Design a binder for this molecule. Structure first.
Ligand code: NA
Ligand code: NA
Lengths: 223, 217
């Protein structure tokens, strides 16, 4: 299938630069142009520019005043967006998208998953992750597992639950900023447990801004 | 006008029909360029919905249709489903700006979905958090509709407002909402009370869960 897969979230100080990548698969890379489009939080889509993947020719939005450059590496089927002199208004999700021709124009027929660029002067911090549990381990009553994810910056984290190699249904909850300016959230294993055994389930917490992943696979005895 | 104009929001009930207008100007629609529409579901990338005024990519339901006359375009959605909630953007090309332009986005809300009461799960502090000299109670709230709740905490029987952080509700995969509330305590507060409770009010009822430091003793 046609697929565009982008690099991960990035954090940068004001005045720095960022390079985001977009790897294409499932079609002939050089036969279709790539566009970049951004979305600042809660706001509208904004075109950044276009690159011809065959010959490398570029076009840009006037809004960027020379601060953006697009490039391509055909050997890697990848395009790159380099944005310099970053400012607070550049905090946004950056998407790539494939330009497809139809009889009377071009449309953006396939989009990457987006990469969040956060422009911030604050330190990046990986989350602490605590195994939490509702219920005890004496009645015919459900035990519910969750993971409390706290003390991280910036947003966001991504959580997955496993039983062995098999991903499990989870409930996701919003992230909230604490009074100390760090963030916190929780993830709950969706299915209550009838027969709890140690090490069977694990929660995996990814925080790409800190290039970090933490897995919790033991729920110790309650106090 | 060198910008596309769409309404900020549209709403309808399940099974009803809505439309989303998008108007442009002499330098885009008036210069001969078509309109395309993109659907952005919560926490997802945009997806192409309509191209070239009225064409559907494979897989897009025929409940979505488009038209354009002159500088006036419209996206019609029949048989509204809860799954349709999200942001819809029009797009064109503009000669005066020498680039692609998008409308501001229209948020579609599907009102009047079936009522659903929240399930509430309350978690005490973990052993590890207590060893770090901290204590957080976590109240997780799931499977409710409409997406408004209020949360109240009590220590024994006394309301507690200090130390509470409660999220805004967010739509989950099954079209119901989820929210959470956190009560930060010191280990002394947690250990010296008989119990703590989270009370969730939704659509004329309140449900309460309680935890106690010696519950799983
Ligand atoms: Na493991
Ligand atoms: Na034309």
């Amino acid at each position: 299938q046609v697929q565009l897969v982008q690099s991960g979230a990035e954090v940068r100080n004001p005045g720095a630069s960022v390079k985001v990548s977009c790897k294409a698969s499932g079609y002939t890379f050089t036969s279709y142009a790539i566009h970049w489009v951004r979305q600042a939080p809660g706001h509208r889509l904004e075109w950044v520019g276009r690159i011809n993947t065959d010959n490398g020719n570029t076009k840009y939005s006037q809004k960027f005043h020379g601060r953006v450059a697009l490039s391509r590496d055909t050997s890697a089927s990848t395009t790159y967006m380099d944005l310099s002199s970053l400012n607070s208004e550049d905090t946004a999700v950056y998407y790539c998208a494939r330009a497809f021709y139809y009889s009377s124009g071009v449309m953006f027929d396939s989009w990457g998953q987006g990469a969040l660029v956060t422009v911030s002067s604050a330190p990046t911090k990986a989350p602490d992750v605590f195994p939490i549990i509702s219920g005890c381990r004496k009645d015919n009553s459900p035990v519910v597992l969750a993971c409390l994810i706290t003390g991280y910056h910036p947003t966001s984290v991504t959580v997955t639950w496993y039983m062995g190699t098999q991903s499990q249904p989870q409930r996701t909850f919003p992230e909230i900023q604490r009074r100390d300016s760090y963030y916190m959230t929780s993830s709950q294993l969706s299915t209550p447990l009838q027969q709890w055994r140690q090490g069977e389930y694990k929660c995996v917490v990814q925080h790409t801004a800190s290039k970090s992943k933490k897995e919790i696979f033991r729920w110790p005895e309650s106090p | 006008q060198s910008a596309l104009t769409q309404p900020p929001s549209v709403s309808g009930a399940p099974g009803q029909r809505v439309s989303i207008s998008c108007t442009g100007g002499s330098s885009n629609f008036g210069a001969g360029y078509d309109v395309h529409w993109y659907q952005q579901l919560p926490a997802t990338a945009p997806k192409l919905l309509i191209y070239g005024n009225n064409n559907r990519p494979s897989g897009v339901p025929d409940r979505f249709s488009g038209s354009k006359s002159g500088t006036s375009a419209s996206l019609a959605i029949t048989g509204l489903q809860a799954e349709d909630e999200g942001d819809y953007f029009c797009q064109s090309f503009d000669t005066s700006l020498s680039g692609w332009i998008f409308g501001g986005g229209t948020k579609l809300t599907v009102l009047g979905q079936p009522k659903a009461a929240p399930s509430v799960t309350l978690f005490p502090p973990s052993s590890e958090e207590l060893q770090a000299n901290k204590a957080t109670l976590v109240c997780l709230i799931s499977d409710f509709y409409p997406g408004a709740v209020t949360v109240a905490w009590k220590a024994d029987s006394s309301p507690v407002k200090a130390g509470v952080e409660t999220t805004t509700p967010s739509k989950q995969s099954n079209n119901k909402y989820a929210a959470s509330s956190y009560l930060s305590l010191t280990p002394e507060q947690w250990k010296s009370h008989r119990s703590y409770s989270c009370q969730v009010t939704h659509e004329g009822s309140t449900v309460e869960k309680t935890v106690a430091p010696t519950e799983c003793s």
